[PDB]
Amino acid sequence: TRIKKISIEGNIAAGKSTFVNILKQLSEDWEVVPEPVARWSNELTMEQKNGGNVLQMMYEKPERWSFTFQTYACLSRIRAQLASLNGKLKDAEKPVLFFERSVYSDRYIFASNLYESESMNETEWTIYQDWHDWMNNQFGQSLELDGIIYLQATPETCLHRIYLRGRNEEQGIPLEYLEKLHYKHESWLLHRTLKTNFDYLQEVPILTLDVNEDFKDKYESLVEKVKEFLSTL
Amino acid sequence: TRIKKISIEGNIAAGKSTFVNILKQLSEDWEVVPEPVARWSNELTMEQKNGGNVLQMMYEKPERWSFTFQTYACLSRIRAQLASLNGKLKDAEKPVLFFERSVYSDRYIFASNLYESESMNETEWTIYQDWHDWMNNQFGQSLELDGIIYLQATPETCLHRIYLRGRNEEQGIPLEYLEKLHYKHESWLLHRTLKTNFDYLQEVPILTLDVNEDFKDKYESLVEKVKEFLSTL
Numbered sequence: 001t002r003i004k005k006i007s008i009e010g011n012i013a014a015g016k017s018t019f020v021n022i023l024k025q026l027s028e029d030w031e032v033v034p035e036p037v038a039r040w041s042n043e044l045t046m047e048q049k050n051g052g053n054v055l056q057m058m059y060e061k062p063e064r065w066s067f068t069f070q071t072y073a074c075l076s077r078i079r080a081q082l083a084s085l086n087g088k089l090k091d092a093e094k095p096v097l098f099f100e101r102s103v104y105s106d107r108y109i110f111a112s113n114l115y116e117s118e119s120m121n122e123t124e125w126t127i128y129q130d131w132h133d134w135m136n137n138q139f140g141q142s143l144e145l146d147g148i149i150y151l152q153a154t155p156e157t158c159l160h161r162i163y164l165r166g167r168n169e170e171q172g173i174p175l176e177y178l179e180k181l182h183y184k185h186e187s188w189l190l191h192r193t194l195k196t197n198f199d200y201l202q203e204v205p206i207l208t209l210d211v212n213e214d215f216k217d218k219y220e221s222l223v224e225k226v227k228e229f230l231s232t233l
Numbered sequence: 234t235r236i237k238k239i240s241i242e243g244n245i246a247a248g249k250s251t252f253v254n255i256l257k258q259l260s261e262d263w264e265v266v267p268e269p270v271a272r273w274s275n276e277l278t279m280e281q282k283n284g285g286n287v288l289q290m291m292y293e294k295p296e297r298w299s300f301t302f303q304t305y306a307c308l309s310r311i312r313a314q315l316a317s318l319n320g321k322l323k324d325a326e327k328p329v330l331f332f333e334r335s336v337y338s339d340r341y342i343f344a345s346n347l348y349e350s351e352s353m354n355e356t357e358w359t360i361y362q363d364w365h366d367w368m369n370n371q372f373g374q375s376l377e378l379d380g381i382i383y384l385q386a387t388p389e390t391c392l393h394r395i396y397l398r399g400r401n402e403e404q405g406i407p408l409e410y411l412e413k414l415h416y417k418h419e420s421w422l423l424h425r426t427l428k429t430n431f432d433y434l435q436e437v438p439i440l441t442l443d444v445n446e447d448f449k450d451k452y453e454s455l456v457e458k459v460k461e462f463l464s465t466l
C-alpha cells in the first residue's frame with residue numbers, strides 16, 4: 001500500500017529481535033513482523049500448538065521433521081506478513097514494515113542448510129522448492145522486498161549471545177553449525193553470489209551492519225544507516 | 234462463472250478415469266482435468282519425477298510419507314486445475330470443466346482416512362488442515378464447485394476392477410481399505426453426515442450415479458443423467 005518492505009536478515013542470536021524492537025519504537029511509520037519461529041520458540045493459538053510440537057520434533061529428529069517444519073514455518077510467515085500489510089501502518093506518510101527474516105531466508109538459508117546436512121532428501125527438497133515457488137506466486141508479490149538489512153556478525157559473536165540469552169536448548173548449538181549458517185548468509189548478502197529463482201532479488205539493495213559491538217544501549221549510528229538507507233529506496 | 238466446475242468423485246477404480254475419458258469426447262465445450270496422482274502411477278517434469286517418488290515412498294511407509302504426499306498431491310491438483318481454468322474453454326458456448334476428484338476428496342477422504350489409519354499423527358493432520366483451510370480460502374470463488382457427480386461403485390466392484398486394471402502395486406491394495414473409503418464417500422456425498430470447513434458444500438448439488446454395472450459400451454443413460462444434472466445448474 002505504498003509501504004516500504006524491509007527484511008532484517010542475519011544468523012541466530014545476532015540481535016534481529018533486539019534491533020527490530022528498537023526500530024518500531026522510534027516511529028509510528030515503522031511496524032514489525034516478528035518471525036513465526038521465534039513466537040513458536042517457547043487459551044493458546046492453534047498455530048503455536050502446531051509450531052510448539054513440530055519445533056521440538058525437529059530438535060529430536062531433524063531427519064524426520066525438516067520438510068514439515070520448513071513448509072509450516074514459511075506458511076506461517078506468508079500469512080503473518082500479508083496480515084501486517086492489511087492492517088499495520090494504517091495509516092502513515094512514510095510507512096515501513098520490518099520483516100523479521102523473510103520467505104527467502106526460509107529457503108536459501110535453513111531449508112537449504114537442512115538438505116545439505118541431509119535432514120531432507122532430494123524429493124523433499126525439490127518438493128519444498130516446488131512448494132515454495134508456487135506458494136509465493138499465488139499469495140506472493142505484495143511482499144516483494146524493497147531492501148534487506150543484514151545484521152552481520154562473526155559466528156563466534158552469536159554463540160556468545162546464545163549463551164547470553166539464557167536458553168538451555170541452544171547452549172548445545174555447535175560453532176560449525178553457526179558457521180554453516182553464517183557462510184550461507186555471506187554468499188547471499190555479502191558477496192551476492194547466491195543466485196535465487198527470484199529475478200528482482202539480485203537487484204534488491206542490501207545494507208550491512210556490524211552487530212559485534214553490543215548496540216542495545218548504543219544504537220544511533222546503526223539507526224542512521226537505516227534512515228539514510230530508507231531515503232535511498 | 235462462467236466455466237462451470239464439476240468434480241467426479243469415486244472409490245479407487247470406481248470408473249472415474251473411464252467416465253471422464255468418455256465424457257471429454259462428447260462436447261467440444263467439455264474438458265477434463267485428471268488428478269496428479271492418477272497420472273504419477275505409471276526426462277519427466279519436476280512434479281512427474283517427485284510424484285513418482287513420493288507415491289513409491291508412501292507405498293513403502295505411509296506413516297512417514299503421508300503428510301508429504303498429501304501436501305504435494307493437493308498442491309499439484311490445484312495447479313493442474315488452475316491451468317485449465319486459466320487457459321482452456323477460453324470462450325466457448327457453454328463451458329463445463331470436469332475435475333477428476335477435488336481438494337475436498339484430497340482432504341476429507343484421503344488425508345482424513347490416513348490420520349484415522351494412524352499414518353498421520355495429530356500435529357501433521359492439524360498442520361495439513363490449517364494450510365488447506367487458509368490456502369483454498371485465498372482464491373475463494375475460483376476452484377469452488379458448481380456440482381459433484383458421485384460414482385457409487387462397491388468395494389468388491391472397485392476390487393473386481395482394480396483387478397481388470399491389473400496394475401502391480403495395486404494388487405497390493407486390500408479389500409478392507411476400500412471399505413472405509415466407501416464409508417467416507419457415502420457419509421460425505423450420499424448420507425451427508427460429514428462436516429467440512431467450506432460452508433457451501435452443504436448447498437452444492439450432487440448427482441449420484443450407481444455405477445456398479447459395466448458401462449464402456451453402455452454409457453448413454455449415464456451421460457443422459459449428466460446433461461439433465463447440469464441443466465439444473
Ligand SMILES: CCc1sc(-c2ccc(OC)c(OCCF)c2)nc1CSc1nc(N)cc(N)n1
Nearest residue numbers: 037058059062070073074106110113114117119
Ligand atoms: C530454530 C529451530 C531449529 S532446530 C534445528 C535443528 C535442530 C537439531 C538439529 O540436529 C540435532 C539440526 O540439524 C541441523 C543440521 F543441518 C537442526 N534447526 C532449527 C532452525 S531451521 C529454521 N527454519 C526456518 N524456516 C526459520 C527458522 N527460524 N529456523
Ligand SMILES: CCc1sc(-c2ccc(OC)c(OCCF)c2)nc1CSc1nc(N)cc(N)n1
Nearest residue numbers: 012041042055056059167169170172173174177
Ligand atoms: C537456533 C535454534 C536451534 S538450532 C539448534 C541446533 C541446530 C543444529 C544442531 O546440530 C547440528 C544442534 O545440535 C544440538 C541439538 F542437539 C542444535 N538448536 C537450537 C535451539 S532449539 C530450541 N527449542 C526451543 N523449544 C526453544 C529454543 N529457544 N530453542
Ligand SMILES: CCc1sc(-c2ccc(OC)c(OCCF)c2)nc1CSc1nc(N)cc(N)n1
Nearest residue numbers: 270271291292295303306307338339343350352
Ligand atoms: C496411489 C495412492 C495411494 S498409495 C496408498 C497406500 C499404500 C500402501 C499402504 O500401506 C501398505 C497404505 O496404507 C495402509 C495402512 F495405512 C496406503 N494409499 C493411496 C491413496 S492416497 C491419495 N490421496 C489423494 N489426495 C488422492 C489420491 N488419489 N490418493
Ligand SMILES: O=c1ccn([C@@H]2O[C@H](COP(=O)(O)OP(=O)(O)O)[C@@H](O)[C@H]2O)c(=O)[nH]1
Nearest residue numbers: 013014015016017018161164165214215216
Ligand atoms: O546488541 C545486542 C544484541 C543482542 N543482545 C543479546 O543477545 C541475544 C540475541 O538477540 P536476539 O534475540 O535479538 O537475536 P535474534 O535471534 O533475534 O537474532 C539476546 O539475549 C539479546 O539481549 C544484546 O544484549 N545486545
Ligand SMILES: O=c1ccn([C@@H]2O[C@H](COP(=O)(O)OP(=O)(O)O)[C@@H](O)[C@H]2O)c(=O)[nH]1
Nearest residue numbers: 245246247248249250251394398447448449
Ligand atoms: O464399466 C467399466 C468401468 C471400468 N472398467 C475398468 O476398470 C479399470 C479401472 O477403472 P477406472 O480407472 O475407471 O477407475 P478410477 O480409479 O479411474 O475411478 C479400468 O482398466 C477400466 O477399463 C471396466 O472394465 N468396466
